[PDB]
Amino acid sequence: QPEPDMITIFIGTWNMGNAPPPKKITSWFLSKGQGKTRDDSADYIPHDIYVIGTQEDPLSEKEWLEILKHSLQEITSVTFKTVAIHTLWNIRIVVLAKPEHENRISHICTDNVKTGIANTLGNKGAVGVSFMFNGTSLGFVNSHLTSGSEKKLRRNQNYMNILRFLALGDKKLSPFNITHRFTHLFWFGDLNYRVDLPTWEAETIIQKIKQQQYADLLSHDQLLTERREQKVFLHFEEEEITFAPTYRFERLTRDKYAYTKQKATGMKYNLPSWCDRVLWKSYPLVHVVCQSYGSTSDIMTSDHSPVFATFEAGVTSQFVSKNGPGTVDSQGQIEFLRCYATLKTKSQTKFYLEFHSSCLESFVKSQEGENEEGSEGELVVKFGETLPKLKPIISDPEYLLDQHILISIKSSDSDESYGEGCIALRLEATETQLPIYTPLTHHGELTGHFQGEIKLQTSQ
């Protein structure tokens, strides 16, 4: 039985509007409805992993697991295994996998973050799941962010609290938040960003939707515009949206958007919006292709429509050589030449680097770099040719070229990370000096850059 080098992952997000689902929800798992939909010829082919995010979910974990498993069994004739289920209030994540993957999945983690303080603490936040699939780390975040058209900044703050405080993945990666811990990170949910047009334009917006003319609406989508201005979701991707806004519908039809202010809305308008989203971030030069992104048309119990996304994702095998794991492979080495970090910090402390990777027996601390002043005010930390030679556990190029090195730049004074990034070892050549680059972030905000050259030696 050969180990896979690709899997397909289903991501679903649905705000259920505190109503039980209808008897049939198979269209969701089949990526059928509006948008980028899945070919009919694939309907019987199971995805490898299904990740279901709900919000305003009124069901018990048991009730929802029974509907999900029976749904997938009807579609695929496969009885899926439950990897994980985690619920915060009415926010839930379920991870299901094909039975053949049971002994490929390990290190399962779950966590939640509650957003807001006092007033604003009590129903919004996120749940997450991570695990290893053979040699590949996978993370999944289902978030229900702050509602309301005039709260995009709150949403962006909820995002930063969730990425700072959701504790998933390998805890040995202590300098790194969830945006660096996984080969593939999927973030989805009722993110609650709105189409930011005047209230008086509600019927115009509805007209545009009925004509399937989304361009003038998406140019005012707060998630796209906030992302464009680097206010939120920096270094994440989203597929092009080609489906109608998924909120706010009259229940039991999809023929009507209910946008007018009501006591039940706190006298807020809910102009038609793409509240329900799927985004991802994968390490550099790993295969990840979105194969569907859309909304269902036939599930109408909620004032939101379910959203689906599917992905091809590269995975690697759990590699064993004669040498590592449990020792170094002297035929392998990673060298760094002419490296420097450019930091936005106004501070003057010394800095050192930490290199973290599952290709190393443990993380490596560098010597302190030399601080200089950039021509436009910046701090430049020069490492020159001073960085340590990294000793991988396995030298086989079939393993080593698939790996990644996480970098943190840390203050000598405080041992606090000022910036985190990631370098792919998927190089154009071995035994050859080649440029490398990563942006550096801290709490998911840009703090600098790391650049230089790498020289990778494999056994070939």
Ligand X SMILES: CN1CCN(c2ccc(C#N)cc2)CC1
Angstrom distance (rounded) from CA 395 to CA 401:
9
Angstrom distance (rounded) from CA 246 to CA 12:
13
Residue 89 or 236: the one with the smaller Cβ distance to ligand X is 236
Q: In what order do the strands lie in the sheet with 136-144?
A: 105-114, 125-133, 136-144, 184-190, 276-282
Residue 290 engages ligand X in binding (rule: CB under 6 A): no
Spell out a b/e string for 229-252, using b for 16 or more CB atoms within 10 Å of the CB, else e: eebbbebbebbebebbbbbbbeee
Residue 68 or 440: the one with the smaller Cβ distance to ligand X is 440
What is the smallest separation between the CB atom of 229 and ligand X, expressed in angstroms? 9
How many residues of this chain bind ligand X (CB under 6 A)? Answer: 3
Beta bridge partners of 354: 365, 408
Residue 220 or 350: the one with the smaller Cβ distance to ligand X is 220
What is the smallest separation between the CB atom of 226 and ligand X, expressed in angstroms? 8
C-beta separation of 419 from 408 below 8 A: yes
C-beta separation of 401 from 432 below 8 A: no
Angstrom distance (rounded) from CA 424 to CA 401:
8
Geometric angle at alpha carbon 189, from 183 and 192, rounded to 5°: 130
Number of H helices, E strands in the chain: 8, 21
Residues 376-435 that bind ligand X (CB under 6 A): none
Residue 228 or 251: the one with the smaller Cβ distance to ligand X is 228
Residues 221-260 that bind ligand X (CB under 6 A): 224, 227-228
Residue 231 or 304: the one with the smaller Cβ distance to ligand X is 231
What is the smallest separation between the CB atom of 233 and ligand X, expressed in angstroms? 8
Residue 5 or 237: the one with the smaller Cβ distance to ligand X is 237
What is the smallest separation between the CB atom of 343 and ligand X, expressed in angstroms? 21
DSSP string, 220-289: TBHHHHHHHTTSSSTT-B-PPP-S---B-BPTT-SS-B--S--GGGTS----SB--EEEEEEE-TT--EE
Residue 258 or 285: the one with the smaller Cβ distance to ligand X is 285
What is the smallest separation between the CB atom of 224 and ligand X, expressed in angstroms? 3
The alpha carbon of 457 is separated from its chain's Cα centroid by a whole number of angstroms, namely 31
Residue 160 or 224: the one with the smaller Cβ distance to ligand X is 224
What is the smallest separation between the CB atom of 389 and ligand X, expressed in angstroms? 33
What is the smallest separation between the CB atom of 175 and ligand X, expressed in angstroms? 24
Burial class (CB in 10 A: 0-12, 13-18, 19+), 438: buried
Residue 115 or 282: the one with the smaller Cβ distance to ligand X is 282
Residue nearest to ligand X (CB): 224
Site string for ligand X, 312-351 (x = CB under 6 A): ----------------------------------------
Residues 185-224 that bind ligand X (CB under 6 A): 224
What is the smallest separation between the CB atom of 281 and ligand X, expressed in angstroms? 10
What is the smallest separation between the CB atom of 241 and ligand X, expressed in angstroms? 10
In the three-class reduction of DSSP (H, G, I as helix; E, B as strand; rest coil), residue 152 is classed as helix
What is the smallest separation between the CB atom of 27 and ligand X, expressed in angstroms? 28
DSSP string, 364-429: EEPPPPEEEE-TTS-EEEEEET-SPPB--S---HHHHTT-EEEEEEEETTT--EEEEEEEE---S-
Geometric angle at alpha carbon 51, from 45 and 55, rounded to 5°: 135
Residues that bind ligand X (CB under 6 A): 224, 227-228
